[PDB]
């Protein structure tokens, strides 16, 4: 249960495509979130009585850049939080949130970057998914491209989303080819490639760092959705994914009894465990989020209504839905984010507005 305590709008009037709370903020520090839209990323700090305090932006030198996505991590040596941002230029920027300086940047993808995710156990491993049909895993400690996930048996159109499982042993990706694909990263090959990426220092050797070209997923399906698949998340060994068909589907590879780690590349079946329907979300690039504990899931629709499902129930199809509406919130909500303590939910919109809901 939540109530709307404040809203604001950013001056550019372009869509805000992304929002993320920093879940690596120190004890006793105020809750901070980043928004991305137009050619900028902006940080805000949440205070009492609904106050949303504007801090500082990073604004790209290219007026034609459009940032789509951001993801928090921290510097593994200093603990200081870092923020990665990317979008239409296909350039990943690593931003120091304190000063909003761009510390370094990576380029590879043949196009726009649609999503960034950090590995759940290793703050240096950054996944990017691209309009060029590939995913890339980067090590931002050694500045190395560890692997490219692609090929003719990889995605055949834009990759729109991906997610690591809890342990960071595998990734599920999804995109415009209507497919969801599993890529295991705990193979001997991949764990070795990771270990070598940490051993690489271009000042101490002559070799370039060789990336893995991974051209075959460990599972693939087009049997969940019938249109572009634009958001995916692991829930334990199950998958939650959505398309633009007004449903989030909960499913797993194989038959009901099949262990995720026994699934082979040729597996032809999937099992649907449930489906959460909602209304008026027919456009693509509309992302749901979960709280830190994965007890809840929030999604906005294309007319400014928020749906929140309580997943603290015995089976996925028993999820309990709550809806959150405000008479002044009428634009498409692109993404939501919960604070780490679950006390605040933020929604951002196509009209550049930001909406704060307090628990």
């Amino acid at each position: 249960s939540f109530k709307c305590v404040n809203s604001l709008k950013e001056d550019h009037n372009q869509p805000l495509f992304g929002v993320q709370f920093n879940w690596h903020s120190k004890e006793g520090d105020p809750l901070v979130f980043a928004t991305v839209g137009s050619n900028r990323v902006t940080l805000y700090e949440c205070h009492s009585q609904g106050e949303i305090r504007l801090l500082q932006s990073y604004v790209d030198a290219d007026a034609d850049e459009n940032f789509y996505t951001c993801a928090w991590t921290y510097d593994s040596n200093t603990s200081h939080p870092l923020l990665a941002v990317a979008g239409s230029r296909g350039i990943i920027r690593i931003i120091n949130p304190i000063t909003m300086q761009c510390i370094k940047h990576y380029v590879g993808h043949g196009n726009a970057i649609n999503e960034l995710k950090f590995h759940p156990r290793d703050p240096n491993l950054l996944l990017s998914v691209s309009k060029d049909h590939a995913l890339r895993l980067w090590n931002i400690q050694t500045d190395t491209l560890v692997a490219i996930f692609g090929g003719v048996e990889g995605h055949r159109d834009e990759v729109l989303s991906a997610d690591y499982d809890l342990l960071g042993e595998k990734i599920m990706s999804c995109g415009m080819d209507h497919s969801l694909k599993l890529w295991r990263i705990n193979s001997k090959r991949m764990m070795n490639a990771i270990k070598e990426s940490y051993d690489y220092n271009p000042n101490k050797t002559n070799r370039p760092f060789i990336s893995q070209k991974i051209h075959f997923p460990d599972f693939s399906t087009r049997d969940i959705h019938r249109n572009y698949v634009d958001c995916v998340r692991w829930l334990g060994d199950l998958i939650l994914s959505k398309s633009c068909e007004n449903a989030i589907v909960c499913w797993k590879p194989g038959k009901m009894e099949d262990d995720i780690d026994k699934i082979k590349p040729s597996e032809s079946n999937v099992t649907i465990l449930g489906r959460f329907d909602y209304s008026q979300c027919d456009i693509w690039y509309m992302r749901f989020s979960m709280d830190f504990w994965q007890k809840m899931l929030a999604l906005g629709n294309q007319v400014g209504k928020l749906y929140v499902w309580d997943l603290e129930v015995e089976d996925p199809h028993k999820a309990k839905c709550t809806t959150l509406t405000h008479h002044k919130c009428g634009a498409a909500i692109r993404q939501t984010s919960f604070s780490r303590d679950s006390s605040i939910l933020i929604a951002v919109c196509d009209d550049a507005s930001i909406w704060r809901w307090d628990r």
Partner: peptide, 5 residues
């Protein structure tokens, strides 16, 4: 499928 309404 359209990206915006």
């Amino acid at each position: 499928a359209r990206k915006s309404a």
